[PDB]
Each structure stands twice: as C-alpha cells, then as structure tokens.
From Swiss-Prot, chain A:
Disease with which this protein is associated in UniProt: Leukoencephalopathy with vanishing white matter 3: An autosomal recessive brain disease characterized by neurological features including progressive cerebellar ataxia, spasticity, and cognitive deficits. Brain imaging shows abnormal white matter that vanishes over time and is replaced by cerebrospinal fluid. Disease severity ranges from fatal infantile forms to adult forms without neurological deterioration. The disease is progressive with, in most individuals, additional episodes of rapid deterioration following febrile infections or minor head trauma.
Shown stretch of the complete protein: 1 to 292 of 452
Name of protein: Translation initiation factor eIF2B subunit gamma
GO molecular function, one term: guanyl-nucleotide exchange factor activity
Keywords, sorted A to Z: Acetylation, Cytoplasm, Disease variant, Initiation factor, Leukodystrophy, Phosphoprotein, Protein biosynthesis
Record-stated family: Belongs to the eIF-2B gamma/epsilon subunits family.
Subcellular location: Cytoplasm, Cytosol
Domain of life: Eukaryota
Keyword flag Phosphoprotein: yes
GO BP terms, alphabetized: cytoplasmic translational initiation; oligodendrocyte development; response to glucose; response to heat; response to peptide hormone; T cell receptor signaling pathway; translational initiation
UniProt GO cellular component terms: cytoplasm; cytosol; eukaryotic translation initiation factor 2B complex; guanyl-nucleotide exchange factor complex
Primary subcellular site in the record, as a coarse category: cytoplasm
Swiss-Prot record, chain B:
UniProt similarity note: Belongs to the eIF-2B alpha/beta/delta subunits family.
Protein's name according to its UniProt entry: Translation initiation factor eIF2B subunit delta
GO BP terms, alphabetized: cytoplasmic translational initiation; myelination; oligodendrocyte development; ovarian follicle development; regulation of translation; response to glucose; response to heat; response to peptide hormone
Domain of life assignment: Eukaryota
Activation and inhibition: Activated by the chemical integrated stress response (ISR) inhibitor ISRIB which stimulates guanine nucleotide exchange factor activity for both phosphorylated and unphosphorylated eIF2.
Localisation: Cytoplasm, Cytosol
Effect of Y324H: In VWM4; with ovarian failure
Keyword flag Cytoplasm: yes
Membrane-spanning parts: none
Keywords recorded for this protein, A-Z: Acetylation, Cytoplasm, Disease variant, Initiation factor, Leukodystrophy, Phosphoprotein, Protein biosynthesis
Gene: EIF2B4
From Swiss-Prot, chain C:
SUPFAM superfamilies linked to this entry: NagB/RpiA/CoA transferase-like
Primary role: Acts as a component of the translation initiation factor 2B (eIF2B) complex, which catalyzes the exchange of GDP for GTP on eukaryotic initiation factor 2 (eIF2) gamma subunit. Its guanine nucleotide exchange factor activity is repressed when bound to eIF2 complex phosphorylated on the alpha subunit, thereby limiting the amount of methionyl-initiator methionine tRNA available to the ribosome and consequently global translation is repressed.
Entry protein name: Translation initiation factor eIF2B subunit beta
One MF term in the entry's GO annotations: translation initiation factor activity
Record comment: activity regulation: Activated by the chemical integrated stress response (ISR) inhibitor ISRIB which stimulates guanine nucleotide exchange factor activity for both phosphorylated and unphosphorylated eIF2.
Subcellular location per the Swiss-Prot or TrEMBL entry: Cytoplasm, Cytosol
Family note: Belongs to the eIF-2B alpha/beta/delta subunits family.
Gene3D superfamilies tied to this protein: Translation initiation factor eif-2b, domain 2
InterPro entries associated with the record: eIF2B_beta_subunit (IPR051855), IF-2B-related (IPR000649), IF_2B-like_C (IPR042529), NagB/RpiA_transferase-like (IPR037171)
GO biological process, one term: oligodendrocyte development
A GO CC annotation given for this chain: cytosol
Curated annotation (Swiss-Prot), chain D:
Modified residues (N6-acetyllysine): K32
Lineage of the organism: Eukaryota, Metazoa, Chordata, Craniata, Vertebrata
One record GO biological process: oligodendrocyte development
Role description: Acts as a component of the translation initiation factor 2B (eIF2B) complex, which catalyzes the exchange of GDP for GTP on eukaryotic initiation factor 2 (eIF2) gamma subunit. Its guanine nucleotide exchange factor activity is repressed when bound to eIF2 complex phosphorylated on the alpha subunit, thereby limiting the amount of methionyl-initiator methionine tRNA available to the ribosome and consequently global translation is repressed.
Gene (name only): EIF2B1
Protein name: Translation initiation factor eIF2B subunit alpha
Regulation of activity: Activated by the chemical integrated stress response (ISR) inhibitor ISRIB which stimulates guanine nucleotide exchange factor activity for both phosphorylated and unphosphorylated eIF2.
Keyword Metal-binding: no
Assembly description: Component of the translation initiation factor 2B (eIF2B) complex which is a heterodecamer of two sets of five different subunits: alpha, beta, gamma, delta and epsilon. Subunits alpha, beta and delta comprise a regulatory subcomplex and subunits epsilon and gamma comprise a catalytic subcomplex. Within the complex, the hexameric regulatory complex resides at the center, with the two heterodimeric catalytic subcomplexes bound on opposite sides.
Organism, scientific name: Homo sapiens (Human)
Pfam families the UniProt entry points to: IF-2B
Length: 244, 357, 318, 265, 421
C-alpha cells in the first residue's frame, strides 16, 4: 500500500459544488473514476454536512466496489477531516475533492512525488501567485493578496539559492495532493491549522523543530497547459468545453 | 504487468543489439499509483535511476541496498512456501524493472549476486521476522564494511603513494577518488588537481566543487586540453566502475583514451576500485556490452544556431554518446584495492581469494 | 594613401579582434588583394625597398594574430615571387611591376582551383563500405567526402571538436548529402578507434618539420590512430604550409575565453580555479602518414622540399 | 654490537654466500638465546647496515614467518633458502640452446650457478658480460666464468645496444623483485631491458623467492632513497620481462603478485 | 544611421579616496592599460563611429592621456570628441548637456569611462531598433545584463541588484538595490502592468552598457532631480518602458571599488574578457607588448627573472621590471619599470609602475600605486593601500585596513615617513 486516497467534501458563490454542479454528468463519479482506473483498491470517502447532511445519498450512487464512508460535521475543513481519519491511515495520503473534473493523467504528479523523495506534490493549471523554479517542477513562494499588507515580500536566501523564480498569476489549484506521513503527524501535533489550502504557505523549508526526517524537505508542483482541469474563475473556456 | 520501453531514435549499426531509451518518457505511465506488481521503493528507485538523479557508481549500489532493505522489511510469508525460494522468485521482476529503467552497473550485479547467495542460504527452521532481521543486518554489515572500510583502506593506500609537490589529474565524477583527494589534502599533502571533464554529462563540476570546498587548488579543462597539460602532469587518478577478468578498466568513456595519451606523455595512470566491483565477465571492446545514453543530449547552444535540434529528420544522421569503455591491461599501472597495491593482472586473483578460495 | 592605410588598418584590427573572414581561402584572397593594392599604389626605386616595405607591413599582420600564419606565409610567398622576378631580371620600374601583377594573378588562378584539384584527386583514396573519422570543421575535408560519395558508399564518423561544437555543422552538411554520418564527442575517440579504418582531418598550419596544428584534440586522434595503425590523410592546401619551426617561437596555441569550457554562472569556485582553453594543439610529423594538396599526395618526409620550392631561407624570421 | 659482528663472521667466511641468508641466520642465532623474540626484534631494528633489497625483504619475510616452534620454523625456512639455488638451476638451465649468445649483467652467484648447470648438461655457448662499472664487477664475473671454461668476452658498458642484435636471449639475475613482476637491480638493467624489447629479445629474470618485496615504484624516483645509495639502483618495468625463475617454478611476472597476495606481505 | 555613444569619463561617486585625487579613475591601470583605453576599445569593437568623452574633474590630465592614444589618430575608425566643462557634477547633468548641445541623433550608447566588456551590442541594437519600429518610439532604454551567480566574487553587495522582468517581451518592471536589505518587497502593479509571464532575476550582473535613445535625454531635460541612472529608472518604472537584453557568453562589468577592481583585473588576467587580452596589444603602444606563456604567465621585454624565482599562476610583468632572486609571485599584476628584491612573496597583489620592493617584504592582496617604495621586513596584510610614492619604514607591520597616503585627512598618515610619523 503506497497510497490511501482521501476525497474531501467541503468548499474552497457561483454554484454549489458537491451535488448541484452537474455540467454534463454527476460530479462525484469522476474522482472515483480517477481512483478506480489506476489501482486504488481501497477508497475512503468523506461525506459533506454543509448541505444539511444530504450529500451521502449522492455519494452512495457511484457504486464503487470498495468504499469507506464517514459522517462529518457541518462546520469542518480538510485538515480537520485529515485529523478525523488519522488513526486509520498508515501510509501516504493522496487528497482529492468532490468537485474535481480532471482530464490530467495523474501519474506525473506521483512521479514528482516519488523521484525526488518529495514531502508534498500538488497539481495546478492556468489571486494566487505561485513562484516556481526555472525547471518548472519545484514551487518556492506562494501567497494571496488578502493577508499581505505589503504587496509581496521575498527572502534573500531563496534568491541566493535560486537566482530566478518564475511567477504565475492565472493558476488554479486542482486539489490533487500527495502527503507524506510526517506531514499529517505535524497536522496532528499542531491542531490550529484548518483548510489545507491555507496550510501550503506555512511549509517551513527555509531558515527557522517543525521538520521530521541544505538538509530540508522537498515540495513540488506541476503546472498543466494541455489537459483541461476544472475551473470556474473566468468560465469562458469552461462553458464552451467538451467532456469526453 | 511491466511492458518494455520503446527504443528512441535511430540506433548505431554496431549498437543495434543494445537498447537506447530517452529520459523524456517514463515506463510508469501505464502502471498503478499504489504500486502492487513492483514494490513502491523499487519504482521510486527506478524513477531516480531513469531521470539521472543517481549517477555515481557507489550511490546506485547504496540506493539499491536501501531499496532492498525496504523490500525485505515489507516482505510477508505465504503459507506452505519457503522464504529462500519465494524471495528469489519475487526479486527477479524487480531487478528486471530496474534494468528496463537503466542498464545496471557491475557493482549492482555483484550486489544482486551476493544478496541472492545470502537469501539462498537461509535455513528453513528460521522464523519470518528473525530471517528479516538477519537479512537486514547482513545488508547493513555488507554496505558498512565494503563501502567505508574499503574506502578508508584505498584512501590510506593512495595517501602513502601521493608525495609532496606533485600534480594530480582526475576525470569524471567518483566519490572514492574525491575522498582520496580530500583525505590527502587534510592530512598534510600539498598538491593541485587538474580536472578533466567531457560532454554531455559534464560531471567534472561535482568533483570540482568538492575540491574547491576542501581547499584544494584546482584546474578545470576538457579532453582536448588534457593533451596540452599532460606534459606538465606527473600523476593521473581515475575512477573505475568495473574491472574485468583480463585486467580491463570499465569506467567513463574518456578513460582508455586519457590513459593512452598519458602513456604517450609517460604519465602513470591510477584507477581506484573496490573489490566488489570486479567481474568474472570479460570483454575486449566498448561494442559488445555498453550503456546508451540520450541522443538528444549531444546538442548544445553555441549562440542561436543549434544544428542538432531536428536531427531525426535527417535519415543519414546518427547520434551516439557512449557511457562505458574498456582499457587494454597494458595501459593501466595501478589497481588500488583494500588488500594492497596490485597490478591489473591480479583482479581474478582477488576474485579467487574473496570468492572463498 | 588614405584609403590604403584605412584598409590596412581595417585588416589589422579584423585580425586582432577575431577570425575575419571565416574561410581561410577567402582570407588568402583578401591577402593577395591587399598585396596587389599595396604594390599598385606606391612608389619605389629598388626592389629591396619594396621587400623591406612588405616586411614592415607583414610584421604588423603577424603581431596582430600570431596564430593566423596564412597571411604571414602568403606575404612570404609573394616576397619569394618578387625575389625570383628580380633574379630573372638581374642576370625595371614598369616591367617588374607588370611581372608582379601577372604573377599574383597567376597565384589567384592557382589558389581558386585548390579545393577543386583536391576533390579531383579525392577518388583515389576512398573505397566502398569504409569507416572514416574526422575532427572539427573544414571545407576541404567535407568537399573531399562529398565528392568521394558521388560514386562510393561509405561511412564517416564526425567527431566534434568541443571547446565549441563546430563539427555539428559538418555533420549536418554531410547528412544533407547522405554520407551516413555518426555524431559523438571527444571522449569516445579511442572507444570507437577500433572500428575506424582511416583518419581524414584538416589542419590550420603545416610546419617546417611536417608537423601541423589543427583543431584541438586531433593529437589524441593521431595517437589513437598510431596505436591502431591506421593511416592519416591530411587534406590541406599549399598556403597553410609555413616555415615556422615548432619550438623556435612562442605563442603556438591560440587561447580564447574560458567561458566555452566553464561558464560564468558556475559560482564561487571560479576564483580558485585556472581554466585554460586551447583551441589548437601540436601534432608531430611521425604521427602523420600522408598530406593531400592540390598538386598531389606528399609525405611528411617531403614537406621540406615544398618549403624549399615555395619559401626562401632568408625570410623565415620575416 | 654483536649482531653486526656475527653477520660479518657469517658473510666474510664464505665470499660465495648471500647477505640475506646470513641475516636470517643471525636472526635465528638471536632466536637461539619471550626473550629470544625480543632479542631478534632488537637486532632486526639494529641491522640497518646493508642497503640491499634482498636483505630487508628476507628480514620482513622472516618477521612474518616467525609469527616454541619459531626456532624449527626458521630452521626449515633456512633449509628451503639453502636448497633454493639447486632448484633455481634445475628449473632455469633447460632454456639455453646450443650455440646461443648469452648476455649477462654484473656478478651474482645465481647466474653463475645456472651457467655451470648449463655447461654441466653438455651445452656450448658464448657469453657477453657487460662490464657494469661504478665498480669493476663484470670483470669479476668474466674472471669467474673464465675459470668455468666457457667463452666469455668483456663487453663495454655502453655497448648493450651494440651487441643486442646478436645476443638471442638476455638472462639477468636480479637482486629484488617487486609485486607486479618488475625487478630492482643494478643500474644498467633498465637500458638492457629497453634495448632487448626494441630488438624483441626475451628478457629473463633469475631470482629466488625471498627477494619478493611489497613495493610498487612507478618511476625511477619512486624506488626508496635508502636503497639507491651516482645511483646504484634502477627499475625495470614488468612488461619488459618475459619470465622469472623461482623455486616454485618458472613463473610469468604476474605470478609474483599472486604469491604475494596469497602470502599477504 | 551612424552609431553614436555618450562616454561619461567621470564617475561622480566618491569611492577612490585618496586614490583618485592624484590621477583620475579612468586613468587607473589594470594591467599597464588605463580604463579609458578599455572603454574606447569596447566602443570601437561594438561598431560606434563617434563617441563623446565627458571629462570634468582633472580633465586636462584625461585629455593629455587620450590625445596621444590610438583613438585620436586620423586612421582610427572611432573618432572621439572631447567636451570639457567645469559646471556639471552629475550623470543627469552630463545627459542634459548632451540634450542641450544637440549631440546625439538616434540610438546612442550610454556607458561609463571604466567599463570592462566584450559584449556584442549589435544584437541588442537590432532588437532595440525592432522594438522602436514596432511600438513607435515607446521603447526608451535597453538595460543590458549578463547571466551570473549569486556567490560570484566579481559582483559585490554594493553592486548586487535584483529585478523582476517580463519573461516574454524581456522588459524590466522593478528595480531596487540589494544593499542592506535581507528581504525584498515587490509591488502589485508590476504584475498588472505586464501579464505575459513574469519572472524575477537575481543572476544579472549590471554591466552599465544600457543603450538608449535621445528621448532619454529629453526626459533628463524635463526633470532636474534625475541625478543619475538608478533614480531615472526608478522614476520611470514608478510612473514609456525600459527593456532588457541578456548576454550569456560575453563578459561585462565596470569598477566601483577596490573589490570590483581586483575582481575585474583577475578576470582580465584569467582571459575572461577575450579578445581584450594583454598580449593582443589592442592599444598600439610600444611598451605594452607581452609574451603569453603557460598558466597565464605574461612577460614583457627585458625582465630578466632572477635565480630561483617562482611564477606559477596568473602573473603579468611589465617592460623594464627588475626582479631579484628567489621570488614567489602568483595572481599578481606588476607594472612597467619595477624593482623587486629578494625572498619576497606577492599573492593577489597589484603593483603599478615605478615601485621598489626591498628584500624580505611580505605583500599580500595590496595595491601599490605609481613610484611607490617599500623597505625591508615589512609585512603587508590583505586590503592595504598605499598611493603615490609612500615610503613605509623598515620593521613595521601594517594592519589589515590601512590606507596610507601623503594627504593627511583622507588616509591614516601624512607626507612624513612610514618609520616615524
């Protein structure tokens, strides 16, 4: 068992994500298809309760051969869902969500996780400014414009160890993650962090006790420009698209 | 199941029997994300072999033995079956997958041979976890002594040869020769090193950084400047990847060439190789068994006029970058092992006295 | 006067800065043009005054680029031509000048058909299904190969000269003609030398011993070819033949910037390293089997006779 | 110093006796008097007189072979060293053809033993002896071979390239053999081996088993300075050497390294 | 059109004290060649037909130096124009004196008088002309840089600069110096101004060969407070756009302090600024020809190396240099006409013309100026400076930071002797 994939059921004002978002077919069947094509004989599914505990009837219609469904609370996040199923996971966690229309062959982000011995591997596709290396595999800086009083600040040591950093603007997170065991161990030891999208910024590779294994941990990201993922920001190419 | 990777490009007519792949595509495009047929540590090892992240001859063996420890730790015993047969039958597709990723070095071949000999000699009365602990302790003792004690012995045996005031020439990237140079500089020898590098790997920059960080005065140049500087060079250190039955030196492709030019300038060459990297296999040329690198690696950017960009459209154009060659045994003087200073003709002697005979 | 000194200064700074022009035959044609332009627009009473003038104008071109011996030994050939004209008229103002004009015109007629004669006699050295190995980039050797492949089917190993990969252009220009070429590096020379049947290389300057300088790494190819006993074919014209002895004068090799070997973005280790990039090398005459010029094939034990027939011993200092 | 006195008494009483044999006999005589091993260690730390390679080589091999059976161990070791030379002659003298032209370096009892074993087997041959003059010892070799009733010619030192084309084989006794198959000998061995290799003549080395030293010189300077002293000592490459003639058999130069790996210094 | 250039022969930053108060900074020799000759050689190797030399402070010495050079000959392709005025005291004052006199026509080269480079500007020139023909004269400046390293010994912290650029149309968005700043704040309007793919660049060595237009001179005329170039580029990027060219195989840098001086002279001796090598004799003088040996050993005419002298790495010896016996010189530059004693060492030092070194001296990483003299048993520590014939007394060990001159207030001593003050 190399991975144990977890499907999240939260959001994050256009349309409701778990049940109502049916573009051409049911939305929840596609991440279970992503799992059940390339292996994943063991599936655990988190159910939504922000729709007043009604998404379990929509999640029990995919008819996968092996599923683990859990009840959850209404006000809850991704990191609290990771802390809920912590004593029943024993290996790497590969996080998905319900509203996921992914045409990307997901073996390449797993290759980025495996080949460099990464602690985290995520998938994005062209608000959030992602500073990536000149190779295009290792992201170095990420922040939003809401929590930054000054516009954006960059340490000098990451300019010394990486002289050029490629920044992107129009990227969106596809929420296809690959977590190592000590990442969720640090999530258990620090229970103040919720909404794992907001956990990607305090990753602590740079100069600072929050690491378990210069000598540091590696985090990668793959930017796609061919296989169309789900997007609802501009919605110009999302409405005039085809679903195969 | 594990398929075969497609051969990339137009092969050399002399190298049609040897496979030539590309680092752009991977074999794990049609494999499961929870690795079931191949062990996950083994597919991690194949990914860090195929992408070129582990290039040293000792680093491949160390990462191989660590992945084998991860496989034996994640091993279970089926009913009415022996470990000493089932582990043999299961480790063979793992090494086949690793071979299809990248061709194996002879150090890794002897590691596979030693591990197969050890797991063959496991008694039937031993338990599951007890035999797992025996195999992990045997792998730990093996990598411990036959990396670091042999490295310290070869470092002392080369420290007692290098004098004061001489100049030393090196080629390629090898941790053993670099450790010899570092432990010779720290213990009191005052020398400078001429580093010879070659295209397209350019792995001389690694030992160049390792010699500048150690405080050694360094000189950096390539294959054509070696003919210019060998009248000033008095000593050549080399890093061997395999030693054969006739005394040949399998190393990087610029080794026998450099040894011939050094003998033409009367400069004695010195290879540094540990005894597990030997071979009962023998070859006399670089044509019957060799590794084929990327044909898209020979191209470079000299201005804005890259000529080998669209090399596949030319039907009469061939691209070749050899990895290994052999030396004739009359060109290489030293063979520095942990047993002492031996010539090239003593390699099957050391094979005999270390093969329980 | 003004245009004369202007074009002389332009040619001197062109040889000081870089390689201008790119072809050595084009530079030889510009050398003969410079010499006929400097003799047609000047005044002299004795021929020795013109000899001293050509010596004084050639010292500056020699000190401009000492690795470019083509302008120097072409000036020396023109000096011997004017000396032979003064000798045949000694045993004189306009007749000697017209003799110099027709002799330098005949020298251009002989120089335009050098590679043509090399390609004409190219057929008597290449057989079918043959493995050829070359180094660097030269128009003479690729013209040799593309004429020899008009009736014969064979193979060429285009080994790159790699301070800067110029042999890729030779490999592409041959593969456009269909010579069934193969591209490798400098580190696979002795590794492939056990399958190489002949070595066909060019050169930059033929020395007085029969020695030659060429694109760098070819001394290694000559040593590997002497080890594997293959004959070396040097397709070289008769204006790269110079009386400069190897150990007589300094500045043999031409050194360039170390950027092409080790780049500027390497880091802090560039302070404590010494990176030298010789783009040429020395090849002794005993490592050479045959020279191919436009008048016929000659031995390395025969370069001194061409030295006596083309050069005068009182001009070797220049 | 009684050890040097016993060494001089054992070496000067017989001028046809080697030095390393007398050194190992001095070590055994100290082992006759634990305290015997301490006295042997004291005299082998005190025997720094002879600058020959064979003396220190036999001392090191006896120091390994010693490590109440030490006296009998040295006894049969000296028995093997004393009976070595007859096996040397009997294994080496079978290669000399009739009417051959012998080339010989300076005086040593080993080449004299193999030439008297060769004339003992009814063979006729002429011997060219290089004079080898930092001191006139090749003249002493020619005098000791003229008493043997064999045709000998005193050859000038700078004529080994002159007479190489007529001497069909080159048999030279060495005084020290390094591990790869090369030899340490008197200074005129290197030029003779190079002229024999350029003239394709077989260069034979006739030395015993106690001269197996664990050294590896690459150049003419890499031999130790305590054995050099106008040098007295050169080095011959093992590629310049055809065969060796030890008491373990007629050996290729790659067999000395096998014996020293099996012996472990 | 003919290619012009504005040559600022006076850097108004006060850095070479008390070095510059005896001879100006464009006349300081790296290896027997003043910096003005390197700058004129780079400008005539670019293709510039006419330059404008602006000498203000010690302008008579600069004029007397460069009139006898090659670039004032009638056979020279690059004719120079000497313009001297004691009124201007700033870079923007130089460029508005260019705009007032109507000197340049179109697409001139803004360059300082101490720039060491071999970059072909003609690719940047044709890219700049193509952008001006496409965007119709809104391409204002093209800042040329070089690919470099963050830990490279040439670029210093007073010259390390970080910029954020548009990675598609190679134009500069942000400009700030890294002096004294461990963190760097980048504004948000940078990403909204250019959205074609943005990327920060820290590996750029500022060669200060930013080619520009006469509209730059118009903008310097319109704003009086634009003193120099960094104020101009920050005032234009805070408000007409400035582009960028990147050089990957050709060197370019100018001197700012003694660290920059030592680094760029070590780059000259190690042949990083080829074709401008000291043996090619680019400035036609009879007393600057050198012979290139192995390991970058340069030897001039009539040096006569003594017995036991060791020259191992990166040495240059001027014409008339007298070296004694048993010396050990490496990574050093020796001027013409020097007197070197016995049993001395020179490690990464720079000794100019006319010096005299006695026996037993220990000089390391120092700068000995013209007509200097050092006595016996004197041990110089690294970064020690002595200018214009300072005599340092015997048996005196100078400290690490010790700048000594005949001028009292700028140095640690005065016109008295070095033995007793």
């Amino acid at each position: 068992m190399e991975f144990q994939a977890v499907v999240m059921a939260v959001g994050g004002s256009s349309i409701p994500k778990p049940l109502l978002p049916v573009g051409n077919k049911p939305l929840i069947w596609y991440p279970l298809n992503l799992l059940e094509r390339v292996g994943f004989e063991e599936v655990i599914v988190v159910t939504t309760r922000d729709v007043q505990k009604a998404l379990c009837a929509e999640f029990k219609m995919k008819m996968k051969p092996d599923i683990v469904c859990i009840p959850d609370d209404a006000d809850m996040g991704t990191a609290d869902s990771l802390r809920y199923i912590y004593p029943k996971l024993k290996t790497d966690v590969l996080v998905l969500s319900c509203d996921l229309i992914t045409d990307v062959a997901l073996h390449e982000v797993v290759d980025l996780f495996r080949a460099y011995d990464a602690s985290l591997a995520m998938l994005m596709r062209k608000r959030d400014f992602i500073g990536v290396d000149s190779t295009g595999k290792r992201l170095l800086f990420m922040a939003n414009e809401a929590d930054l009083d000054e516009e954006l600040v960059i340490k000098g040591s990451i300019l010394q160890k990486h002289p050029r950093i490629r920044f992107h603007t129009g990227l969106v997170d596809a929420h296809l993650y690959c977590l190592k065991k000590y990442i969720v161990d640090f999530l258990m030891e620090n229970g103040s962090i919720t909404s794992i999208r907001s956990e990607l910024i305090p990753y602590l590779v740079r100069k600072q006790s929050a690491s378990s294994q210069l000598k540091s941990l590696d985090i990668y990201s793959f930017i796609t420009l061919n296989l169309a993922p789900y997007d609802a920001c501009w919605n110009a190419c999302r409405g005039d698209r085809w679903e195969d | 199941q594990v398929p075969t990777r497609k051969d990339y490009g137009s092969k050399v007519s002399l190298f049609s029997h040897l496979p030539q792949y590309s680092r752009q595509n991977s074999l794990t495009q049609f494999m499961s994300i929870p690795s079931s047929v191949i062990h996950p540590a083994m597919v991690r090892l194949g990914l860090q072999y195929s992408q070129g992240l582990v290039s040293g001859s000792n680093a491949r063996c160390i990462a191989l033995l660590r992945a084998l420890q991860q496989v034996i730790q994640d091993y279970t015993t089926p009913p009415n079956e022996e470990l000493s047969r089932d582990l043999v039958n299961k480790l063979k597709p793992y090494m086949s997958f690793l071979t299809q990723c990248r061709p194996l070095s002879a150090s890794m071949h002897n590691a596979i041979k030693f591990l197969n000999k050890e797991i063959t000699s496991v008694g039937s009365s031993k338990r599951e976890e007890e035999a797992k602990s025996e195999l992990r302790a045997a792998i730990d003792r093996y990598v411990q002594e036959k990396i670091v004690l042999a490295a310290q012995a070869i470092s002392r045996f080369a420290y007692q040869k290098i004098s004061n005031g001489d100049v030393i020439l090196v080629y390629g990237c090898s941790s053993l020769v670099s450790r010899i140079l570092q432990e010779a500089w720290t213990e009191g020898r005052r020398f400078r090193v001429v580093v010879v590098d070659s295209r397209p790997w350019l792995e001389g920059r690694h030992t160049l950084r390792s010699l500048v960080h150690a405080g050694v005065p360094a000189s950096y140049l390539l294959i054509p400047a070696a003919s210019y500087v060998l009248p000033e060079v008095s000593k050549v250190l080399l890093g061997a990847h395999a030693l054969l039955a006739n005394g040949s030196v399998m190393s990087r492709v610029g080794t026998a060439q450099l040894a011939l030019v050094a003998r033409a300038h009367n400069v004695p060459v010195l290879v540094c190789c540990e005894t597990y990297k030997f071979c009962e296999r023998v070859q006399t040329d670089a044509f019957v068994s060799n590794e084929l690198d990327d044909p898209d690696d020979l191209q470079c950017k000299r201005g804005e006029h890259v000529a080998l960009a669209n090399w596949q459209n030319h039907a009469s154009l061939r691209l070749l970058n050899l990895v290994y060659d052999v030396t004739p045994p009359e060109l290489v003087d030293l063979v520095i092992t942990e047993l002492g200073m031996i010539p090239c003709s003593s390699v099957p002697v050391v094979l005999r006295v270390k093969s329980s005979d | 006067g003004s245009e004369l000194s202007e074009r002389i200064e332009s040619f001197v700074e062109t040889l000081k800065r870089g390689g201008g022009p790119r072809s050595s035959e084009e530079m030889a044609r510009e050398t003969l043009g410079l010499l006929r332009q400097i003799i047609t627009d000047h005044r002299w009473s004795n021929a020795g005054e013109l000899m001293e003038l050509i010596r004084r104008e050639g010292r500056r071109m020699t000190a401009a680029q000492p690795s470019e011996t083509t302008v120097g030994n072409m000036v020396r050939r023109v000096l011997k031509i004017i000396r032979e004209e003064y000798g045949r008229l000694h045993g004189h103002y306009a007749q000697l000048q017209s003799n110099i004009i027709e002799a330098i015109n005949e020298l251009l007629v002989e120089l335009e058909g050098t590679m043509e004669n090399i390609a004409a006699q190219a057929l008597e050295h290449i057989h079918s299904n043959e493995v050829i190995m070359t180094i660097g980039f030269s128009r003479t050797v690729e013209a040799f190969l593309k004429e020899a492949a008009r009736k014969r089917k064979f193979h060429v190993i285009v080994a790159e000269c790699a301070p800067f990969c110029q042999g890729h252009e030779m490999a592409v220009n041959l593969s456009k003609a269909g010579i069934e070429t193969t591209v490798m590096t400098d580190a696979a020379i002795f590794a492939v030398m056990s399958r190489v049947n002949k070595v066909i290389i060019g050169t930059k300057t033929i020395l007085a011993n029969g020695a030659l300088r060429a694109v760098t790494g070819t001394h290694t190819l000559a040593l590997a070819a002497k080890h594997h006993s293959t004959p070396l074919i040097v397709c070289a014209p008769m204006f790269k033949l110079s009386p400069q002895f190897p150990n007589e004068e300094d500045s043999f090799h031409k050194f360039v910037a170390p950027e092409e070997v080790l780049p500027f973005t390497e880091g802090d280790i560039l302070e404590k390293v010494s990176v030298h990039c010789p783009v040429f090398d020395y090849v002794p005459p005993e490592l050479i089997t045959l020279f191919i010029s436009n008048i016929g094939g000659n031995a390395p034990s025969y370069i001194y006779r061409l030295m006596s027939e083309l050069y005068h011993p009182d001009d070797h200092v220049l | 110093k009684e050890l040097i006195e016993y060494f001089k008494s054992q070496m000067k009483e017989d001028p046809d006796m080697a030095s390393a044999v007398a050194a190992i006999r001095t070590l055994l005589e100290f082992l006759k008097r634990g305290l015997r091993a301490n006295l042997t260690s004291a005299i082998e730390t005190l025997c720094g007189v002879d600058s020959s390679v064979a003396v220190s080589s036999g001392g090191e091999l006896f120091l390994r072979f010693i490590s109440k059976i030490m006296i009998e161990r040295g006894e049969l070791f000296l028995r093997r060293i004393s009976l070595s030379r007859n096996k040397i002659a009997d294994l080496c003298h079978t290669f000399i053809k009739d009417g051959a032209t012998i080339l010989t370096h300076a005086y040593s009892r080993v080449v004299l033993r193999v030439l008297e074993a060769a004339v003992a087997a009814k063979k006729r041959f002429s011997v060219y002896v290089t004079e080898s003059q930092p001191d006139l010892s090749g003249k002493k070799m020619a005098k000791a071979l003229c008493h043997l009733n064999v045709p000998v010619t005193v050859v000038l030192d700078a004529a080994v390239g002159y007479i190489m084309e007529k001497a069909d084989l080159v048999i030279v006794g060495a005084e020290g053999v390094v591990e790869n198959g090369g030899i340490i000998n008197k200074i005129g061995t290197n030029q003779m081996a190079v002229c024999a290799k350029a003239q394709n003549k077989p260069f034979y080395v006739v030395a015993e088993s106690f001269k197996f030293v664990r050294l590896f010189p690459l150049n003419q300077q890499d031999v130790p300075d305590k054995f050099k002293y106008h040098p007295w000592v050169d080095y011959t490459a093992p590629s310049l050497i055809t065969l060796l003639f030890t008491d373990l058999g007629v050996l290729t130069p790659s067999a000395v390294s096998d014996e020293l790996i099996k012996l472990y210094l | 059109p003919p290619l012009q250039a504005v040559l600022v022969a006076d850097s108004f930053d006060r850095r070479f004290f008390p070095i510059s108060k005896d001879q100006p900074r464009v006349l300081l020799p790296l290896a027997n060649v003043a910096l003005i000759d390197y700058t004129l050689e780079f400008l005539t190797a670019t293709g510039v037909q006419e330059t404008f030399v602006f000498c203000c402070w010690k302008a008579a010495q600069i004029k007397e130096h460069l009139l006898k050079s090659k670039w004032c000959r009638p056979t020279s392709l690059n004719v120079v124009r000497i313009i001297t005025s004691e009124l201007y005291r700033s870079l923007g004052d130089v460029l508005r004196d260019v705009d007032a006199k109507a000197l340049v026509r179109s697409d001139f080269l803004l360059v300082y008088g101490d720039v060491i480079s071999n970059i072909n500007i003609t690719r940047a020139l044709e890219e700049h002309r193509l952008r001006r023909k496409l965007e119709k004269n809104v391409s204002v400046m093209t800042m040329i840089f070089k690919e470099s390293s963050p830990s490279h010994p040439t670029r210093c912290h007073e010259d390390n600069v970080v910029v954020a650029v548009d990675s598609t149309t190679n134009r500069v968005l942000h400009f700030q110096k890294t002096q004294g700043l461990r963190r760097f704040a980048f504004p948000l309007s940078l990403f909204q101004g250019s959205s074609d793919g943005v990327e920060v660049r820290y590996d750029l060595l500022d060669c200060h060969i930013s080619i520009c237009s006469p509209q730059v001179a118009q903008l310097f005329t319109d704003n009086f407070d634009y003193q120099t170039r960094d104020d101009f580029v920050r005032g234009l990027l805070v408000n007409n756009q400035i582009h960028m060219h990147v050089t990957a195989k050709e060197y370019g840098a100018r001197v700012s302090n003694l660290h920059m001086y030592s680094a760029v002279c070590a780059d000259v001796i190690r042949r990083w600024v080829y074709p401008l090598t000291p043996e090619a004799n680019f400035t036609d003088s009879t007393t600057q020809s050198c012979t290139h040996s192995r390991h970058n050993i340069y030897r001039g005419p009539e040096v006569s190396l003594g017995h036991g002298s060791i020259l191992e790495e990166n040495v240059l010896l001027g014409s008339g240099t007298v070296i004694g016996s048993n010396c050990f010189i490496t990574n050093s530059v020796i001027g013409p006409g020097c007197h070197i004693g016995d049993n001395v060492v020179l490690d990464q030092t720079y000794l100019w013309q006319g010096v005299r070194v006695a026996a037993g001296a220990q000089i390391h990483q120092s700068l000995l100026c013209d007509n200097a003299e050092v006595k016996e048993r004197v041990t110089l520590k690294p970064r020690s400076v002595l200018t214009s014939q300072v005599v340092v007394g015997p048996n005196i060990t100078l400290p690490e930071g010790s700048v000594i001159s005949l001028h009292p207030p700028d140095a640690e001593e005065d016109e008295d002797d070095g033995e007793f003050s």
